[PDB]
Design a protein around this ligand. Structure first.
Ligand code: RET
Length: 225
């Protein structure tokens, strides 16, 4: 057992409770719109959980040579994010009745963001790793921009209950998402300042808040109906 296993086991559990809790709740609703929010928001933690459980069994980890040592890299995150991040975005988009072309672009951006962050994490030349990280972040700030400006202004043209739920969900997403690039920069994938075990703790906290925490705020609100 690697020092960080405690945090993988604790994400596993929390994603697990979150997935089943949402599954149940959503299975009892008959409203066709609420069902759609549920399927999507249940699928996120579902994908998370199977990927955290994978990591807890020691898969999804490779050694990458850079700055003269063998650094450990949990590529399994990216497998998870790749599919979970668009899923969250989609929620926000359904919520504000956003245009088809906005969604494609956001997903577009998102693929870019995760794609590059991964290549970042696998690059053997130390310098270049930061070239990818900076592209990934650029792609991300593009996303947040559109959420904050684009989506909010769409939210205005909906009921107060829907708009004010979006805002909460918007704020939560802007706080968590903007932590990730910093964690990566200071963690084992970047500067190797914060060790792997603490890096995992921070990602789990962010992973869980952003899927269990989000789902809970969204799924309890009248605005899904
Ligand atoms: C459920 C998982 C969520 C909601 C994760 C979001 C992850 C990001 C917003 C990742 C951003 C990254 C950068 C901005 C550059 C560095 C590497 C990435 C993946 C960590």
């Amino acid at each position: 057992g690697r020092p960080e296993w405690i945090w993988l086991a604790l994400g596993t559990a929390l994603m697990g409770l979150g997935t089943l809790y949402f599954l149940v709740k959503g299975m009892g609703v008959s409203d066709p719109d609420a069902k759609k929010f549920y399927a999507i928001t249940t699928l996120a933690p579902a994908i998370a959980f199977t990927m955290y459980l994978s990591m807890l069994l020691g898969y999804g980890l490779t050694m990458v040579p850079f700055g003269g040592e063998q650094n450990p890299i949990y590529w399994a995150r990216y497998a998870d994010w790749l599919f979970t991040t668009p899923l969250l975005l989609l929620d926000l988009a359904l919520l504000v009745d956003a245009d088809q072309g906005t969604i494609l672009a956001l997903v577009g951006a998102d693929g870019i963001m995760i794609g590059t962050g991964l290549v970042g994490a696998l690059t053997k030349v130390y310098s270049y790793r930061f070239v990818w990280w900076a592209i990934s972040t650029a792609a991300m700030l593009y996303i947040l921009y559109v959420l904050f400006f684009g989506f909010t202004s769409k939210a205005e043209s909906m009921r107060p209950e829907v708009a004010s739920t979006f805002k909460v969900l918007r704020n939560v997403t802007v706080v968590l998402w903007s932590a990730y690039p910093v964690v990566w920069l200071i963690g084992s994938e970047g500067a190797g300042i914060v060790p792997l075990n603490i890096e995992t703790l921070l990602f789990m906290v962010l992973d869980v808040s952003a899927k269990v925490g989000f789902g809970l705020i969204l799924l309890r609100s009248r605005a899904i109906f």
